[PDB]
Amino acid sequence: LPGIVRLSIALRIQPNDGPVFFKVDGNRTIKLLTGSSYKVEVKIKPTTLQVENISIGGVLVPLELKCKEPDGERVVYTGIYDTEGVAPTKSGERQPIQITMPFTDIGTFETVWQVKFYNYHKRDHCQWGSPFSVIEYECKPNETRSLMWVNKESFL
């Protein structure tokens, strides 16, 4: 419908392009591996939208426009998310990490994931649970509640 942005985010662990899983804590915790890397696949509509990248916990993931969604109506952007240098989660089974994705001249998508970062050599602790193919978001750049960018303030 007019003014609805739909975006899905998928992660596939390298080198096998395998699935990513969540666990329930208290409430969905995404299980991610440190010292590793992920294919990131972003599917957007409308197809007139332009994304340049996605940032995950402060890590920049440059996105490249790839093609039209096989068997679908979105456009597909992919990049590689590098988790080399990310600290494993030390306590409390999860931690919040910031997701940020700018759409040029439309607005910015932000959300918080709950994540457990696993030590590289505990990949067998990480790669199991409930696999999810994507996280699907419905976004409204002109919702009443969408915070407008304040470009300037002037006392007159």
Binding site for Na ion (CB under 5 A): 107, 141, 146
Distances (CA, A) of 20 to 5, 17, 154: 24, 9, 49
Classified as helix, coil or strand, 122 is helix
Shortest Cβ 108–Na ion spacing (Å)? 9
Shortest Cβ 128–Na ion spacing (Å)? 39
Task: Give 133 or 146: the residue with its C-beta nearer to Na ion.
Answer: 146
Task: Return the C-alpha torsion angle 33, 37, 39, 41, nearest 10.
Answer: 60
C-alpha 7/C-alpha 75 separation (Å) is 10
Task: Give 130 or 146: the residue with its C-beta nearer to Na ion.
Answer: 146
Task: Give 73 or 143: the residue with its C-beta nearer to Na ion.
Answer: 143
Shortest Cβ 85–Na ion spacing (Å)? 33
Largest CA-CA distance found in the chain, in angstroms, rounded: 63
Shortest Cβ 138–Na ion spacing (Å)? 14
Task: Give 98 or 146: the residue with its C-beta nearer to Na ion.
Answer: 146
DSSP 29-80: EEEEETT-EEEEEEEEESTT--B-EEEETTEEEE-EEEEEPTTSSSEEEEEE
Shortest Cβ 31–Na ion spacing (Å)? 33
Task: Give 111 or 146: the residue with its C-beta nearer to Na ion.
Answer: 146
Pairing of strands 107-118, 28-33: parallel
